[PDB]
Amino acid sequence: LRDCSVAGWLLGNPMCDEFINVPEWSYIVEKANPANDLCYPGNFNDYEELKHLLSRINHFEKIQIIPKSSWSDHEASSGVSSACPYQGTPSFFRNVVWLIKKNNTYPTIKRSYNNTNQEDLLILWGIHHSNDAAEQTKLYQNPTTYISVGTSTLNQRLVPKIATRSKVNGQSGRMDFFWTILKPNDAINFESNGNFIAPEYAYKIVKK
Amino acid sequence: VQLQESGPGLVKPSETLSLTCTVSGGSINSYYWSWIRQPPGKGLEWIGYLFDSGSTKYNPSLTSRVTISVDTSKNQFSLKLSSVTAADTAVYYCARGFWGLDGFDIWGQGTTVTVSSASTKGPSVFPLAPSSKSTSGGTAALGCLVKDYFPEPVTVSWNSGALTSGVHTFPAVLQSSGLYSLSSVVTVPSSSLGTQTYICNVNHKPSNTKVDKKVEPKS
Amino acid sequence: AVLTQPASVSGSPGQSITISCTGTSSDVGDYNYVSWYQQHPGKAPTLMIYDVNKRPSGDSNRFSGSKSGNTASLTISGLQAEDEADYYCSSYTSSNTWVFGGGTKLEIKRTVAAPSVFIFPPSDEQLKSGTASVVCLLNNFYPREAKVQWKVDNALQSGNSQESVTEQDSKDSTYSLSSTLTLSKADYEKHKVYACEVTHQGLSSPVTKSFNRG
Ligand SMILES: *[C@@H]1O[C@H](CO[C@@H]2O[C@@H](C)[C@@H](O)[C@@H](O)[C@@H]2O)[C@@H](O[C@@H]2O[C@H](CO)[C@@H](O)[C@H](O)[C@H]2NC(C)=O)[C@H](O)[C@H]1NC(C)=O
Ligand SMILES: *[C@@H]1O[C@H](CO)[C@@H](O)[C@H](O)[C@H]1NC(C)=O
């Protein structure tokens, strides 16, 4: 990869444009000082192990698993930050959606995706720890929230922590990202009332 | 998993249509849930769907009149359509789907709703008598005429579902009185009219009518 | 909304047929969420294809979907009599809605088949009620086009008859037709000859069926 890490590539960092059906690579050469990693500051959980799985993976096909238009009770193109601009305009990651409240309400998300493909899918999603109670209610209305993610082999119940950070590129909040492998005919279940960074695009993968 | 629509099949103009879907053998949760209708002899029309915990989106042409709601504890979801007119007379279906399917995989059987001020009325069943009036060998035809009922639908079987070969049940026509009529017919062996018994079973649930009629070649 | 589908398509048993479904960028074009449903009348539609080209089960073995631009297509290979149905496409849209196409009646093109014609006089039970219904039955014919004419003592009739047609039979692909002539009990007993004359490609000459008392 040119100037992007692996997380910034999989998440769709606007800086990176390596996508579509990106050709069956013969493993990946990534610089250790990845120019543009995450837009926001934060951690990409189990980056370690995902890098080992991407070793035995040769080909990728991006697919849309949950249309961005289906979040019609939330705002879906308001979550933008200067952390990462597309032109000079503040943008966000393409493959994942930052859901904001719509008109002082954040209805509770409770939604499933079933992998009806023949390949395993690599799915990515995030959580937002907001700076202050002010930013929390400003972005998500509900002061006390949760994220809940389930498959047949995964069980997440997260609670985002209000806490003011040391600013990295002008933001005192952070975003953590997670990933899993959904087998054919298994389903991933999402449920949240705030702070959820939702998937839109996942990746079909075949191994050895 | 099974879905069943429930509610009244006759609503007065300007009143509110109310229907409920009862889900059996599975849970509401994490699926999305939709209502679809089909006016008689027309195509399918998407009314709207419910998703997530209780979010909805409606067809733009109906959104000011429709309410879709859910009751997870009874495993049901519901449709309300206000200020109904004759253009809302339709078969109404509830349906399920999920992301990764992205269409609708399980459908209810449909329930007929008719918008009208008229009252329910049961059919009269008259015979269509056979004889040795023969056309094309497997001659002899008989049936029964199911006349002047309202609203739709009626069901017809022969000999309690045991005779289905050669039976045709025609689509109802609405006649100038505003009442429905239809006929069901069977082709039968001419040589055994004397000995075989043919009974047509008419069922009109909206009026709780259920009449059997033996059809025979008279004299 | 309504996607554009041909009102009908036609095929002989054994051949392949295709049904098109045309929308715009905001539904068929941008997403891969086109489904196809098969509906027999009086029953609920049945999902036959989803995500443009996936089959729910072996019932869809002969069915195959594709998409090109804003136009989706459904192909059915080795057409069978039992494939007769209405077919509807559907698409998710960018408004978080679904839209359907207008529906395509699939017709099975079989050999010619002459009707069998039967005429039924009104029953005595019904005449006691004040109206007389006289039924003419045309059974198991093909093709669909058929002229039924009523004649009471040779006087041609108009405006006093209705008819309905069955759907194509799922096993031999024929149609049946019922023509009902309605008269007052008063006008029924004023005449003698009641006749039904049928014209159809399967008959070399029109066939007339008739009865007397009335
Ligand atoms: C994820 O979906 C699969 C597939 O569902 C079936 O196929 C769809 C296209 C649609 O037609 C559904 O109505 C079907 O049920 C589920 O796997 C099926 O599960 C049912 C459960 O009764 C079973 O009868 C089938 O044999 C299964 N088919 C296969 C290919 O495995 C699966 O359960 C779903 N995952 C979850 C977590 O619910
Ligand atoms: C915003 O939401 C409020 C509910 O608190 C409602 O009164 C109002 O109609 C909404 N405004 C919109 C949808 O423009």
Coordinates of C-alpha atoms in Angstrom, one line a residue, chain B residues 40-195:
Chain B
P40 CA -58.4 -7.3 -7.3
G41 CA -56.9 -8.1 -10.7
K42 CA -54.0 -5.6 -10.2
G43 CA -50.4 -5.7 -9.1
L44 CA -48.6 -5.7 -5.8
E45 CA -48.1 -2.4 -4.0
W46 CA -45.7 -1.8 -1.2
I47 CA -47.4 0.0 1.7
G48 CA -44.5 0.3 4.2
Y49 CA -42.3 -1.6 6.6
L50 CA -41.2 -1.6 10.3
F51 CA -37.6 -2.1 11.2
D52 CA -35.1 -1.9 14.1
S53 CA -36.9 -1.4 17.4
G54 CA -39.9 0.5 16.0
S55 CA -38.8 2.7 13.1
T56 CA -41.0 2.8 10.0
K57 CA -40.9 4.0 6.4
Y58 CA -44.0 4.2 4.3
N59 CA -44.8 4.4 0.6
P60 CA -44.8 8.1 -0.4
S61 CA -48.3 8.0 -1.8
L62 CA -49.9 6.6 1.4
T63 CA -47.6 7.9 4.2
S64 CA -50.1 10.5 5.5
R65 CA -52.7 7.7 6.2
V66 CA -50.7 4.7 7.3
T67 CA -49.4 3.6 10.7
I68 CA -47.4 0.5 11.2
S69 CA -46.7 -0.6 14.8
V70 CA -45.2 -3.6 16.6
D71 CA -46.0 -5.4 19.9
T72 CA -43.0 -7.6 20.6
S73 CA -44.6 -9.2 23.7
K74 CA -47.5 -10.6 21.6
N75 CA -45.2 -11.3 18.6
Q76 CA -47.5 -9.2 16.3
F77 CA -47.3 -6.2 14.2
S78 CA -50.1 -4.1 12.9
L79 CA -51.3 -1.8 10.1
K80 CA -53.7 1.1 10.4
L81 CA -54.9 2.9 7.2
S82 CA -57.2 5.9 7.9
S83 CA -59.8 7.6 5.8
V84 CA -60.2 4.5 3.5
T85 CA -62.0 4.7 0.1
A86 CA -62.9 2.1 -2.5
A87 CA -59.4 2.4 -3.9
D88 CA -58.2 0.6 -0.7
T89 CA -60.3 -2.5 -1.5
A90 CA -57.5 -5.1 -1.8
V91 CA -56.0 -8.3 -0.6
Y92 CA -53.5 -7.3 2.2
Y93 CA -50.4 -9.4 2.9
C94 CA -47.9 -9.2 5.8
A95 CA -44.4 -10.2 5.0
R96 CA -40.9 -10.8 6.5
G97 CA -37.4 -10.2 5.3
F98 CA -33.9 -9.4 6.5
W99 CA -30.7 -7.8 5.3
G100 CA -28.9 -10.3 3.1
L101 CA -32.2 -11.3 1.7
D102 CA -33.3 -7.8 0.8
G103 CA -36.7 -8.8 -0.4
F104 CA -39.5 -10.7 1.3
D105 CA -39.1 -14.4 2.1
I106 CA -42.2 -15.4 4.1
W107 CA -45.7 -14.0 3.4
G108 CA -49.0 -14.4 5.1
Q109 CA -51.8 -15.9 3.2
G110 CA -53.5 -12.6 2.6
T111 CA -56.8 -11.2 3.9
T112 CA -59.4 -9.6 1.8
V113 CA -60.7 -6.2 2.9
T114 CA -63.5 -4.5 1.0
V115 CA -64.4 -0.8 1.5
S116 CA -68.2 -0.4 1.4
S117 CA -71.3 0.7 3.3
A118 CA -73.2 -2.5 2.3
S119 CA -73.9 -5.4 4.7
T120 CA -72.6 -8.9 4.5
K121 CA -74.9 -11.3 2.6
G122 CA -74.7 -15.1 2.1
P123 CA -74.8 -16.9 -1.2
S124 CA -77.7 -18.9 -2.7
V125 CA -76.5 -22.2 -4.3
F126 CA -78.3 -23.6 -7.3
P127 CA -77.5 -26.7 -9.3
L128 CA -76.2 -26.9 -12.9
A129 CA -77.7 -30.3 -13.7
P130 CA -76.1 -32.8 -16.0
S131 CA -77.8 -35.2 -18.5
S132 CA -77.1 -37.2 -21.6
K133 CA -76.2 -33.9 -23.4
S134 CA -72.7 -34.8 -24.4
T135 CA -69.7 -32.8 -25.7
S136 CA -66.3 -34.5 -26.4
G137 CA -66.6 -37.9 -24.9
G138 CA -65.8 -37.2 -21.3
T139 CA -69.2 -35.7 -21.7
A140 CA -71.5 -34.7 -19.0
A141 CA -70.9 -31.6 -17.1
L142 CA -72.4 -30.4 -13.9
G143 CA -71.8 -27.7 -11.4
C144 CA -73.4 -25.3 -9.0
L145 CA -74.1 -21.6 -9.3
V146 CA -73.1 -19.6 -6.2
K147 CA -75.1 -16.3 -6.5
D148 CA -75.6 -13.0 -4.7
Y149 CA -73.0 -12.9 -1.9
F150 CA -71.0 -10.1 -0.4
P151 CA -68.2 -9.5 0.2
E152 CA -65.5 -11.7 -1.2
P153 CA -64.4 -14.5 -0.9
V154 CA -66.3 -17.9 -1.2
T155 CA -64.7 -21.3 -1.4
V156 CA -66.0 -24.3 -3.3
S157 CA -64.9 -27.9 -3.1
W158 CA -66.6 -31.1 -4.4
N159 CA -67.3 -34.1 -2.3
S160 CA -65.3 -32.6 0.6
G161 CA -62.1 -32.2 -1.5
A162 CA -62.1 -35.8 -2.7
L163 CA -63.1 -34.8 -6.3
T164 CA -60.6 -32.4 -7.8
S165 CA -60.0 -33.9 -11.3
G166 CA -61.9 -31.9 -14.0
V167 CA -63.2 -29.2 -11.6
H168 CA -63.1 -25.6 -12.6
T169 CA -64.1 -22.8 -10.2
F170 CA -64.5 -19.5 -12.0
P171 CA -63.4 -16.1 -10.7
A172 CA -66.3 -14.2 -9.2
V173 CA -67.9 -11.4 -11.2
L174 CA -69.5 -8.3 -9.5
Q175 CA -72.9 -7.7 -11.0
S176 CA -74.9 -4.4 -11.3
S177 CA -76.6 -5.1 -8.0
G178 CA -73.2 -4.9 -6.3
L179 CA -73.4 -8.5 -5.2
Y180 CA -71.0 -11.3 -6.3
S181 CA -71.7 -14.4 -8.3
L182 CA -69.6 -17.3 -9.5
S183 CA -69.9 -20.9 -10.7
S184 CA -67.9 -24.1 -10.2
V185 CA -68.2 -27.0 -12.7
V186 CA -67.0 -30.6 -13.1
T187 CA -66.8 -32.9 -16.1
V188 CA -68.0 -36.4 -15.2
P189 CA -68.6 -39.8 -16.8
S190 CA -72.0 -39.7 -18.5
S191 CA -72.7 -43.4 -18.0
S192 CA -72.6 -43.1 -14.1
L193 CA -74.8 -40.1 -13.5
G194 CA -77.4 -42.3 -11.9
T195 CA -75.1 -43.9 -9.4

